[PDB]
Design a protein around this motif. Structure first.
Motif, PDB file in Angstrom:
ATOM      1  N   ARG A 100      -0.204 -11.311  -6.857  1.00 58.93           N
ATOM      2  CA  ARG A 100      -0.317 -10.136  -7.096  1.00 58.93           C
ATOM      3  C   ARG A 100      -1.869  -9.867  -7.195  1.00 58.93           C
ATOM      4  O   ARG A 100      -2.468  -8.398  -7.560  1.00 58.93           O
ATOM      5  CB  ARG A 100      -0.313 -11.472  -8.717  1.00 58.93           C
ATOM      6  CG  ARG A 100      -1.485 -10.655 -10.389  1.00 58.93           C
ATOM      7  CD  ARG A 100      -1.939 -11.107 -10.562  1.00 58.93           C
ATOM      8  NE  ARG A 100      -2.988 -11.998 -10.209  1.00 58.93           N
ATOM      9  CZ  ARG A 100      -3.373 -13.824 -10.462  1.00 58.93           C
ATOM     10  NH1 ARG A 100      -2.710 -14.456 -11.950  1.00 58.93           N
ATOM     11  NH2 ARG A 100      -4.170 -13.751  -9.934  1.00 58.93           N
ATOM     12  N   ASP A 101      -2.905 -10.676  -6.325  1.00 56.73           N
ATOM     13  CA  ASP A 101      -4.308 -10.272  -5.916  1.00 56.73           C
ATOM     14  C   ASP A 101      -3.870  -9.503  -5.337  1.00 56.73           C
ATOM     15  O   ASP A 101      -4.880  -8.243  -5.037  1.00 56.73           O
ATOM     16  CB  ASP A 101      -4.664 -11.263  -6.109  1.00 56.73           C
ATOM     17  CG  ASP A 101      -5.573 -11.960  -7.182  1.00 56.73           C
ATOM     18  OD1 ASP A 101      -4.941 -11.962  -8.178  1.00 56.73           O
ATOM     19  OD2 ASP A 101      -5.982 -12.680  -7.479  1.00 56.73           O
ATOM     20  N   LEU A 102      -3.136  -9.054  -4.443  1.00 59.50           N
ATOM     21  CA  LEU A 102      -2.693  -8.620  -3.052  1.00 59.50           C
ATOM     22  C   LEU A 102      -2.307  -6.690  -3.717  1.00 59.50           C
ATOM     23  O   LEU A 102      -3.115  -5.773  -3.103  1.00 59.50           O
ATOM     24  CB  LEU A 102      -2.309  -8.605  -1.983  1.00 59.50           C
ATOM     25  CG  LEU A 102      -2.052  -8.820  -0.468  1.00 59.50           C
ATOM     26  CD1 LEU A 102      -2.602  -8.922  -0.306  1.00 59.50           C
ATOM     27  CD2 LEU A 102      -0.336  -8.962   0.514  1.00 59.50           C
ATOM     28  N   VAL A 103      -1.236  -7.045  -4.580  1.00 58.87           N
ATOM     29  CA  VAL A 103      -1.440  -5.853  -5.033  1.00 58.87           C
ATOM     30  C   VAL A 103      -2.548  -5.398  -5.967  1.00 58.87           C
ATOM     31  O   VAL A 103      -2.535  -3.607  -6.030  1.00 58.87           O
ATOM     32  CB  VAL A 103      -0.094  -5.958  -6.499  1.00 58.87           C
ATOM     33  CG1 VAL A 103      -0.234  -4.738  -6.596  1.00 58.87           C
ATOM     34  CG2 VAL A 103       1.612  -6.121  -5.520  1.00 58.87           C
ATOM     35  N   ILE A 105       7.138  -7.596  -6.682  1.00 57.93           N
ATOM     36  CA  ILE A 105       6.235  -8.253  -6.270  1.00 57.93           C
ATOM     37  C   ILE A 105       5.168  -9.101  -6.890  1.00 57.93           C
ATOM     38  O   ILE A 105       4.690 -10.091  -6.366  1.00 57.93           O
ATOM     39  CB  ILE A 105       5.447  -6.751  -5.386  1.00 57.93           C
ATOM     40  CG1 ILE A 105       6.581  -6.933  -4.142  1.00 57.93           C
ATOM     41  CG2 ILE A 105       4.032  -7.782  -4.110  1.00 57.93           C
ATOM     42  CD1 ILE A 105       5.945  -5.432  -3.052  1.00 57.93           C
ATOM     43  N   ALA A 106       4.186  -8.295  -7.820  1.00 55.46           N
ATOM     44  CA  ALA A 106       2.938  -8.713  -8.222  1.00 55.46           C
ATOM     45  C   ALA A 106       3.383 -10.139  -8.843  1.00 55.46           C
ATOM     46  O   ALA A 106       2.883 -10.449  -9.248  1.00 55.46           O
ATOM     47  CB  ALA A 106       2.334  -7.887  -8.930  1.00 55.46           C
ATOM     48  N   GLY A 107       5.086 -10.666 -10.055  1.00 58.47           N
ATOM     49  CA  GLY A 107       4.997 -10.993 -10.485  1.00 58.47           C
ATOM     50  C   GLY A 107       5.837 -12.100  -9.693  1.00 58.47           C
ATOM     51  O   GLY A 107       6.506 -12.941 -10.514  1.00 58.47           O
ATOM     52  N   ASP A 108       5.410 -12.124  -8.828  1.00 55.11           N
ATOM     53  CA  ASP A 108       5.453 -13.589  -7.241  1.00 55.11           C
ATOM     54  C   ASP A 108       4.706 -14.601  -7.732  1.00 55.11           C
ATOM     55  O   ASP A 108       4.783 -15.842  -7.588  1.00 55.11           O
ATOM     56  CB  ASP A 108       6.209 -13.149  -5.903  1.00 55.11           C
ATOM     57  CG  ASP A 108       6.732 -14.188  -4.839  1.00 55.11           C
ATOM     58  OD1 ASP A 108       7.545 -14.600  -5.223  1.00 55.11           O
ATOM     59  OD2 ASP A 108       5.214 -14.323  -4.776  1.00 55.11           O
ATOM     60  N   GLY A 109       3.712 -14.748  -7.492  1.00 59.47           N
ATOM     61  CA  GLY A 109       2.237 -15.464  -7.759  1.00 59.47           C
ATOM     62  C   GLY A 109       0.957 -14.130  -8.006  1.00 59.47           C
ATOM     63  O   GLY A 109       1.140 -13.502  -7.272  1.00 59.47           O
ATOM     64  N   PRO A 115       0.532  -1.361  -0.494  1.00 55.17           N
ATOM     65  CA  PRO A 115       0.401  -0.063  -0.176  1.00 55.17           C
ATOM     66  C   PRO A 115       0.709   1.264  -0.041  1.00 55.17           C
ATOM     67  O   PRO A 115       0.488   2.452  -0.793  1.00 55.17           O
ATOM     68  CB  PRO A 115      -1.034  -0.107   1.183  1.00 55.17           C
ATOM     69  CG  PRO A 115      -0.038  -0.682   1.899  1.00 55.17           C
ATOM     70  CD  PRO A 115       0.394  -1.561   1.042  1.00 55.17           C
ATOM     71  N   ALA A 116       1.959   0.985   0.524  1.00 56.54           N
ATOM     72  CA  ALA A 116       2.471   2.243   0.867  1.00 56.54           C
ATOM     73  C   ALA A 116       3.163   2.807  -0.763  1.00 56.54           C
ATOM     74  O   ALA A 116       3.820   3.994  -0.917  1.00 56.54           O
ATOM     75  CB  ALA A 116       4.215   2.154   1.540  1.00 56.54           C
ATOM     76  N   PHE A 117       3.719   2.273  -1.894  1.00 60.78           N
ATOM     77  CA  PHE A 117       4.338   1.792  -2.809  1.00 60.78           C
ATOM     78  C   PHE A 117       3.267   2.382  -4.045  1.00 60.78           C
ATOM     79  O   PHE A 117       3.534   2.783  -4.498  1.00 60.78           O
ATOM     80  CB  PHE A 117       5.354   0.764  -3.369  1.00 60.78           C
ATOM     81  CG  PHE A 117       6.390   0.421  -3.140  1.00 60.78           C
ATOM     82  CD1 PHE A 117       7.390   1.004  -3.754  1.00 60.78           C
ATOM     83  CD2 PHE A 117       6.656  -0.376  -2.865  1.00 60.78           C
ATOM     84  CE1 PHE A 117       8.835   1.310  -2.589  1.00 60.78           C
ATOM     85  CE2 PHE A 117       7.861  -0.830  -2.514  1.00 60.78           C
ATOM     86  CZ  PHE A 117       8.441  -0.055  -2.869  1.00 60.78           C
ATOM     87  N   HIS A 158      -5.349  -4.093  -2.804  1.00 64.38           N
ATOM     88  CA  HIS A 158      -4.745  -2.546  -2.679  1.00 64.38           C
ATOM     89  C   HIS A 158      -5.421  -1.178  -3.192  1.00 64.38           C
ATOM     90  O   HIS A 158      -5.000   0.037  -2.919  1.00 64.38           O
ATOM     91  CB  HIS A 158      -3.443  -2.490  -2.188  1.00 64.38           C
ATOM     92  CG  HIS A 158      -3.685  -3.650  -1.309  1.00 64.38           C
ATOM     93  ND1 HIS A 158      -3.258  -4.753  -0.417  1.00 64.38           N
ATOM     94  CD2 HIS A 158      -3.525  -2.516   0.461  1.00 64.38           C
ATOM     95  CE1 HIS A 158      -3.180  -4.645   0.913  1.00 64.38           C
ATOM     96  NE2 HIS A 158      -3.506  -4.438   1.256  1.00 64.38           N
ATOM     97  N   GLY A 159      -5.746  -1.630  -4.980  1.00 65.75           N
ATOM     98  CA  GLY A 159      -5.970  -0.811  -6.161  1.00 65.75           C
ATOM     99  C   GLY A 159      -5.127  -0.550  -6.125  1.00 65.75           C
ATOM    100  O   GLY A 159      -5.077   0.865  -6.285  1.00 65.75           O
ATOM    101  N   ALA A 160      -4.050  -1.040  -6.985  1.00 69.60           N
ATOM    102  CA  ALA A 160      -2.270  -0.337  -7.948  1.00 69.60           C
ATOM    103  C   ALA A 160      -3.208  -0.489  -9.108  1.00 69.60           C
ATOM    104  O   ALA A 160      -1.940   1.275 -10.173  1.00 69.60           O
ATOM    105  CB  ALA A 160      -1.929  -1.377  -7.614  1.00 69.60           C
ATOM    106  N   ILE A 161      -3.879  -0.758  -9.671  1.00 70.82           N
ATOM    107  CA  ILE A 161      -4.153  -0.428 -11.231  1.00 70.82           C
ATOM    108  C   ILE A 161      -4.841   0.708 -11.294  1.00 70.82           C
ATOM    109  O   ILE A 161      -4.454   1.066 -12.398  1.00 70.82           O
ATOM    110  CB  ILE A 161      -5.344  -1.793 -11.668  1.00 70.82           C
ATOM    111  CG1 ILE A 161      -5.431  -2.740 -11.802  1.00 70.82           C
ATOM    112  CG2 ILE A 161      -6.445  -1.035 -13.095  1.00 70.82           C
ATOM    113  CD1 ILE A 161      -5.475  -4.165 -11.925  1.00 70.82           C
TER     114      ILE A 161
END
Lengths: 12, 416
Positions: free
Chosen positions: B117-120, B109-113, B85-87, B123-126
């Motif tokens: 990915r769904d966590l990113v 982070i999102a490219g780990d799994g 969320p900070a990023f 938290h509303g990154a899109i």
């Protein structure tokens, strides 16, 4: 009849 | 500096002492688990919120990025430390270089799994990511910046078990289409990979992509000279033609078939194989679609691949031929035989692969059914004999597989 569709994972 | 020196400086109430210490922690990482043991990750994350001090923001993002690029335990340490969320908050930073750090970090982070990915996503990154790409001129963005943004989006599209949320993919797709019109090879590659991920699923996932009008630009990229561009373009096209007949039709109407003489003869093995795989799914289509393969003069190319390629590409060619004979007209099958399909087909009947034998026997059976409607079964029989086919079909009666010995037994009793 008609041919068989194969997804990428079905190919490998 | 050693760990204890940094811990003291970071934990002081002097901002410049905190900055100096974070700079030192950056260069050390540039002893991860000792840094984590001292609990320095939550300090780095809190420093990301010091808007009045962009230097310590930069230094902290860097430190958090290094640790996140390590093992799973360390990445989750960074994540459970609250880096996501900070990023995301820093994506809209007035400091462009800080925004870029946040993009790259969220990308790893999102490219780990799927979970991260769904966590990113959750938290509303899109929305803020897409906002960054909503500029009228993409050239106003740094080339590295633009590449990182594209790569991050593709990671948000990547992975199944589970696939990304439908609403997420829906929001991202139109931006991916626009990036397909870019001229940077790396931007194009990642965008094509993103498309290949989204089309790697049920027909519903394919339909979302196809309905956006992405196919004509994919077909254009299929003709590119850069292999890192052609490879995912071909994959994406290939995934699409695994779908319905009408989805496959849109690929055909885009003029994809014209590129395949070069694809099927491409010196790179992988390109040949997946182009042949792609062809196999097109010949699995309707009679009018099969006719399009014919009209583009692709049948001699398929015959060529079946004859002179590596075995696994030959198997894909055998699939293309059998799918051709299953849906094709008697006339289309006659033309296939005239292109010299019988001998290379027979040569592969001696392969140690059970699957290709079943597939070829099915092709032979279909061709005989056509010959029957012609009253030319004897000539087909004589043709198959004269290229060593009869000897192989008979040997296949003592095969261990039920489908194989049944089919070959049927063919022998029926035509020989």
């Amino acid at each position: 009849s008609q041919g068989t569709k194969r997804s990428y994972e079905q190919m490998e | 500096w050693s760990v204890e020196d940094i811990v003291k400086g970071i934990n002081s109430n002097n901002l410049e002492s905190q900055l100096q210490a974070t700079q030192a922690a950056r260069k050390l990482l540039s002893p991860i688990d000792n840094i984590i043991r001292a609990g320095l990750i939550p300090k780095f994350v809190s420093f990301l919120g010091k808007t009045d001090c962009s230097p310590i923001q930069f230094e902290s993002a860097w430190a958090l990025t290094n640790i996140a690029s390590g093992t799973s335990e360390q990445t989750k340490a960074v994540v459970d430390g609250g880096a996501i969320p900070a990023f995301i908050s820093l994506l809209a930073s007035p400091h462009a270089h800080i925004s870029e750090q946040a993009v790259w970090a969220l990308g790893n982070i999102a490219g780990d799994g799927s979970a991260f990915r769904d966590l990113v996503i959750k938290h509303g990154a899109i929305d803020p990511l897409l906002a960054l790409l909503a500029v009228p001129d993409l050239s106003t963005l740094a080339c590295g910046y633009l590449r990182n943004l594209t790569w991050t989006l593709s990671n948000l599209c990547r992975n199944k078990n589970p696939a990304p949320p439908l609403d997420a993919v829906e929001q991202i797709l139109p931006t991916l289409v626009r990036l397909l019109h870019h001229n940077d090879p790396e931007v194009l590659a990642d965008s094509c990979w993103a498309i290949s991920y989204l089309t790697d699923g049920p027909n519903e996932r394919i339909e979302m992509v196809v309905k956006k009008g992405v196919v004509p630009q994919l077909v254009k990229l299929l003709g590119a000279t850069e292999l890192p561009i052609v490879t995912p373009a071909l994959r994406a096209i290939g995934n699409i033609v695994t779908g319905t007949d009408e989805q496959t039709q849109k690929v055909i109407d885009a003029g994809a078939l014209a590129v395949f003489p070069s694809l099927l003869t491409n010196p790179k093995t992988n390109i040949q194989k997946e182009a042949t795989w792609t062809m196999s799914n097109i010949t699995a289509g309707r009679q009018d679609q099969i006719q399009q393969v014919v009209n583009h003069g692709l049948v001699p190319f398929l015959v060529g691949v079946l004859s002179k390629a590596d075995f696994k590409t030959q198997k894909e060619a055998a699939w293309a031929i059998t799918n051709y004979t299953s849906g094709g007209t008697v006339e289309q099958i006659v033309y296939l035989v005239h292109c010299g399909i019988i001998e290379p087909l027979m040569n592969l009947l001696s392969a140690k692969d059970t699957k290709i034998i079943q597939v070829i026997l099915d092709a032979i059976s279909n061709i005989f059914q056509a010959a029957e409607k012609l009253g030319e079964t004897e000539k087909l029989s004589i043709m198959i004999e004269e290229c060593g086919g009869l000897d192989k079909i008979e040997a296949l009666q003592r095969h261990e597989n039920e489908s194989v010995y049944k089919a070959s037994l049927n063919l022998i009793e029926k035509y020989f």
